[PDB]
Amino acid sequence: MPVKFHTKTLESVIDPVAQQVGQLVLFHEQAESGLLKEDLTPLVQGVGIAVTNLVQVAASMVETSNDEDFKAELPPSMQEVQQAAVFLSDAARLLKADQGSPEGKRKLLDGARGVINGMSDLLMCADRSEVRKMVKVCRSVQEYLDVAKVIDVEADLATFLQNLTPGMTSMMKVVEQRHPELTNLAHAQMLKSELGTVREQIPILISSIRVCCLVIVKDSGMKDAAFGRDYVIQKLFIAIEEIIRVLQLTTTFEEEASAASLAHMFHQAQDALASGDISRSTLDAVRKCISEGRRVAALAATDETRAKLLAAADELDQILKELEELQAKGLGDSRQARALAHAAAVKLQELEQEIRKALAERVATDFVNVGGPIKALEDAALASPSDPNRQANFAQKAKEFEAHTARLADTAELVASSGGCSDAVAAELRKEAAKLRDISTAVVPAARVVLENPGNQAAKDYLRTVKEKWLEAAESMGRSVDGVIDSLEFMKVSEARIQADVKEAKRIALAEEDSMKLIAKASSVARQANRVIQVAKVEADNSENPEFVAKLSSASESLAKSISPMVIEAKAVVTSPQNKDIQRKFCSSADKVVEGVAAVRSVIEDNWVPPRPPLPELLPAEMQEAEEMLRAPLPPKDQNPIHHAAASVFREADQWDEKGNDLISLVKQMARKMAMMSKYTRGESRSKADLIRMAKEIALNAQELLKLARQIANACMDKRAKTNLLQLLDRIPTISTQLKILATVKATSMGGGDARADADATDMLVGNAENLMRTVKDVIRASEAACIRLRPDSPIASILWRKKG
């Protein structure tokens, strides 16, 4: 039974006691080295009193509960932890008598680990009781959900409703009581999200049941209404399943390529090419970037960007062949090899930019009219029964809707896979896409119930509700997509497409072709312009720069004030297609639209900043030993996992020079300290005090890192990168607290005793430390990303992000 800290009460109780026990070990080693004999009696009395009082408040509950599992599991843990406290008392006695007392050392370490693990179990049987109760409630309501499938009259829906509401409330009050107690923010977020799902799905369920009760008397569309109802029942069932699963998690989540790794590989290949490097590694990375370029080319919106991306790919391959022929001749060091490699770096940047342009083009095409097709489907379902072709229209609009939403989700997947977004934004985008598909499965059945039940108002209202759910999911997914996509590229592509479509509309307006072409092209222009408005809104929201937000607001508002007059002038042309004056009015209005789009593009263009840094054109004995370790060859992977993680961090921070950058200094120092910790846990033959003290030093270093990186996030005017850094900073403190606790547990188990306890203690310590190192590394990269758009006055602006050498 490992130590637990998934609960604020668990951490709150175990943290100070583990600190006191660690101090007992530190004092024992302070007298072992002969520095000063310290009497451990007061500290042991404190730990023993904490144990006694926890045993008191826990023993007062053996009568109060009404589940026999808790009453059965309490006494063994109580006697266990009390026995460990006794071991601490004996340790104080014997070690006070003789420093070299073997029984004193043994009982000191044994009782030391036993009060920590024992307190953990003492609180954990209670926590298991609570979780069993909550899961019991969730199981009851989840089981009662299935009764809704037999409801056919609104009386059954009334009784079922009045039985479902109190149970649902009893579940939500308990879960809403639970998630403020968890130490893992991710678990709390999952609980809150599923709570939202249930709360929004209840009235949908009762509504779908209502349409079933109305359509059962048709003596017609029963299969699709039943499909809708059972779809909502399954969504509720799954959400409650996930609530039950997260309720029972007692583990840290973050201890259980991508788009950001593709972008990082692009940038690493660009930096290595801009230098002198043309080794096999760099060329392999370049070839991977070419493969990504061709992969995006196969999914391009038009054959022009496809053939262009392929052209850049084959050009880069040719440059690679030329570089390899140069290197084969012996001219790898020559200036023409370096100049050719630098040209390859520039071409790799241009390939990256064209990839961004292709994604922005896919977004410009697929999201130009998100709500159109589903509105056409709803109107197709609402066709009067006299319409001799309502079935064909409904079928066509249905298939067009399915292909539309499928295209939206596919484009979201492409952006998530190649948009250079962080892993968190990518996971969120993919989640919103999967939700969009899932809710899309229910759109056609509802509209088909309306189609075959005209005089049914309940089916109409349910179809409208499902329509608004689809529009909500699709619009939020669109907001995420616009958040990832490079906005300047969206404004350029939209400016060009709007120019071509406005030109074609003026052509159709002057030379009298079909007015249907004119209203179609004109409304398409209006939709593209409004999409420019929306993307400008997302870009303005993401900036904390008030002047840029004001300018962009002026451009977007000025553009929006020109869209409607253009459309009404177009309709005026369809009224009098022969009037040349109305044609002139419409042409001037459309030109005004083009000018507004150009204005928004100009604001975003003038606020544009190069993302990454540009290209070129040509100690104490402890930290010193850790430096020699981290610059020596790596230890065998099986033997020093902590050292490997610390080496990945040290290597991530080592490519940057330290002057003018305290973050790199803190991170390098933290890597050295973590390597020392690895060495101290590896000791088996003291290393305990060095392990505990080293853990505390790493914790303090993590505190300072959180302070500085928070100062960097505060002065950042890019809410995307700001959020990216804060998401990583928010889990560091719990990691460091768990680090100190787990290192204190490991120190009291290594060097004799139990083997299982030492194994689990080791594995938990190394998992925690690996997670901490991953977090610190991602904090390096996220901080470098946050230092791109800093306020011109903050001191953080003076930070130096120049590559070493």
Side-chain angles (χ1 to χ4, degrees), residues 1-4 77 80 117-118 120-121 124 128 756 760 764:
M1 303 138 302
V3 60
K4 299 295 182 176
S77 55
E80 187 78 14
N117 291 335
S120 172
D121 299 333
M124 262 310 298
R128 280 182 295 172
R756 166 182 67 108
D760 298 345
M764 295 174 68

Side-chain angles (χ1 to χ4, degrees), residues 146-222:
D146 222 48
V147 176
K149 305 190 177 184
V150 208
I151 304 180
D152 274 39
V153 195
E154 274 177 332
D156 289 340
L157 176 52
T159 66
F160 160 84
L161 204 167
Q162 90 177 32
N163 304 348
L164 184 68
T165 295
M168 277 292 180
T169 292
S170 68
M171 181 182 66
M172 295 179 192
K173 70 166 193 162
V174 151
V175 179
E176 268 289 340
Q177 163 65 24
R178 174 63 171 181
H179 72 72
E181 292 179 337
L182 298 182
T183 53
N184 194 324
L185 290 172
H187 297 340
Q189 188 55 59
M190 302 181 79
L191 292 175
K192 290 183 297 181
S193 59
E194 310 303 328
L195 282 173
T197 289
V198 177
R199 248 187 277 262
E200 65 180 88
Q201 285 308 296
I202 292 305
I204 317 305
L205 174 55
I206 69 169
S207 182
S208 59
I209 298 173
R210 197 142 291 158
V211 344
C212 292
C213 298
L214 291 206
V215 303
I216 194 55
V217 207
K218 289 309 149 56
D219 197 343
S220 180
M222 302 152 55

Side-chain angles (χ1 to χ4, degrees), residues 92-263:
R93 298 178 24 249
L94 308 174
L95 288 187
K96 178 189 174 185
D98 179 26
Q99 166 60 27
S101 174
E103 323 284 10
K105 183 180 183 298
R106 185 188 74 86
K107 304 186 94 57
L108 181 77
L109 296 178
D110 266 28
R113 186 177 44 84
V115 293
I116 304 176
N117 291 335
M119 281 175 126
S120 172
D121 299 333
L122 247 190
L123 298 166
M124 262 310 298
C125 52
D127 186 89
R128 280 182 295 172
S129 182
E130 307 292 341
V131 173
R132 282 197 306 264
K133 176 205 64 60
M134 312 193 171
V135 170
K136 171 180 170 185
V137 168
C138 300
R139 287 301 198 192
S140 72
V141 52
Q142 183 189 38
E143 289 163 6
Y144 190 63
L145 279 179
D146 222 48
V147 176
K149 305 190 177 184
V150 208
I151 304 180
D152 274 39
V153 195
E154 274 177 332
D156 289 340
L157 176 52
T159 66
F160 160 84
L161 204 167
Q162 90 177 32
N163 304 348
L164 184 68
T165 295
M168 277 292 180
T169 292
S170 68
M171 181 182 66
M172 295 179 192
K173 70 166 193 162
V174 151
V175 179
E176 268 289 340
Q177 163 65 24
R178 174 63 171 181
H179 72 72
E181 292 179 337
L182 298 182
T183 53
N184 194 324
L185 290 172
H187 297 340
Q189 188 55 59
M190 302 181 79
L191 292 175
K192 290 183 297 181
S193 59
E194 310 303 328
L195 282 173
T197 289
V198 177
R199 248 187 277 262
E200 65 180 88
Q201 285 308 296
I202 292 305
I204 317 305
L205 174 55
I206 69 169
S207 182
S208 59
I209 298 173
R210 197 142 291 158
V211 344
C212 292
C213 298
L214 291 206
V215 303
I216 194 55
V217 207
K218 289 309 149 56
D219 197 343
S220 180
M222 302 152 55
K223 263 165 49 188
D224 295 315
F227 178 88
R229 175 198 58 198
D230 300 342
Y231 165 84
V232 182
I233 302 176
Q234 254 297 338
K235 179 173 286 185
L236 281 166
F237 183 92
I238 285 170
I240 295 181
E241 276 290 310
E242 189 70 9
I243 279 178
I244 294 175
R245 190 189 68 87
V246 180
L247 269 172
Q248 296 176 328
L249 285 185
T250 62
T251 54
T252 301
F253 189 28
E254 293 74 1
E255 299 183 26
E256 178 177 348
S258 62
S261 295
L262 277 170

Side-chain angles (χ1 to χ4, degrees), residues 505-513 577 580 583-584 586-587:
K506 292 186 295 184
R507 170 194 173 273
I508 299 174
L510 289 188
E512 293 319 304
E513 288 180 336
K580 315 295 181 180
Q583 294 175 354
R584 289 190 295 262
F586 158 71
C587 292

